[PDB]
Amino acid sequence: ALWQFNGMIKCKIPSSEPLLDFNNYGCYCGLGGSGTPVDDLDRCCQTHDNCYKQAKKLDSCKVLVDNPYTNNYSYSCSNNEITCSSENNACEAFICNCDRNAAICFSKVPYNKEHKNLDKKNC
Amino acid sequence: ALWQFNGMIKCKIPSSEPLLDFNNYGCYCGLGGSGTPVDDLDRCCQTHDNCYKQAKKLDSCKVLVDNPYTNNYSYSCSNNEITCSSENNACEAFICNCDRNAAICFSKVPYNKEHKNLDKKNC
Numbered sequence: 001a002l003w004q005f006n007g008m009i010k011c012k013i014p015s016s017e018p019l020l021d022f023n024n025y026g027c028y029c030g031l032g033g034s035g036t037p038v039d040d041l042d043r044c045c046q047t048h049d050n051c052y053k054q055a056k057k058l059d060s061c062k063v064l065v066d067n068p069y070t071n072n073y074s075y076s077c078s079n080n081e082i083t084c085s086s087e088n089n090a091c092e093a094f095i096c097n098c099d100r101n102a103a104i105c106f107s108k109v110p111y112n113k114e115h116k117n118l119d120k121k122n123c
Numbered sequence: 124a125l126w127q128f129n130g131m132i133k134c135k136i137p138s139s140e141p142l143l144d145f146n147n148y149g150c151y152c153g154l155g156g157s158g159t160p161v162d163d164l165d166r167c168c169q170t171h172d173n174c175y176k177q178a179k180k181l182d183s184c185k186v187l188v189d190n191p192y193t194n195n196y197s198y199s200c201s202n203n204e205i206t207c208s209s210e211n212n213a214c215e216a217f218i219c220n221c222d223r224n225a226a227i228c229f230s231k232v233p234y235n236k237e238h239k240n241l242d243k244k245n246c
């Protein structure tokens with residue numbers, strides 16, 4: 001779910017509030033996403049969107065009435081490392097992995113303030 | 124909470140259902156507990172009971188209306204290792220630690236079937 005992803009990002013980037021800093025950035029970071037990523041952070045978001053689209057195709061994911069942003073899973077942050085738990089059932093484990101890769105992606109690319117609240121007509 | 128503790132035990136002892144195997148064992152494993160522990164597993168339970176009693180004394184724990192068995196926290200099981208998450212606020216982190224020490228204790232001591240559903244008059 002959205003609250004775990006928020007925690008995963010804070011695990012890698014302790015100085016940020018992800019829901020404020022990364023929401024509505026470029027063409028992909030945020031609800032939906034279309035067009036060409038405007039930069040590397042936006043591209044992290046695009047990969048994350050694709051990952052969630054893949055999860056939806058899974059037989060296991062389609063058995064639970066739960067949106068990826070509400071489907072809770074278990075993970076831990078220890079010494080700024082993210083660990084998805086083995087207690088996670090197949091769907092939740094796929095989602096946890098998507099979220100983990102994105103948090104790490106986010107922390108490795110440049111943040112361009114010019115792309116915050118990007119005019120969706122650039123997409 | 125009780126469901127995380129159940130998962131922590133299964134993390135260290137994958138062959139068991141903790142709620143069935145360890146509930147009502149000796150004088151301490153289970154709701155309450157008095158008397159002298161009948162063995163080492165029962166003593167793990169006693170330490171766990173004391174840990175939960177300590178948690179209750181904490182200023183931070185006393186601010187939340189939540190029983191230790193309902194107060195959810197975050198942890199992960201990876202390659203049979205338990206890791207309490209840094210996302211845990213003070214109370215939850217104390218409780219997570221109590222639970223982790225007990226799961227590990229459980230997995231290191233003998234299990235005596237004679238003490239299952241011990242007649243509470245031995246306590």
Ligand SMILES: [Ca+2]
Nearest residue numbers: 028030032033
């Ligand atoms: Ca998106």
Ligand SMILES: [Ca+2]
Nearest residue numbers: 151153155156
């Ligand atoms: Ca007890």
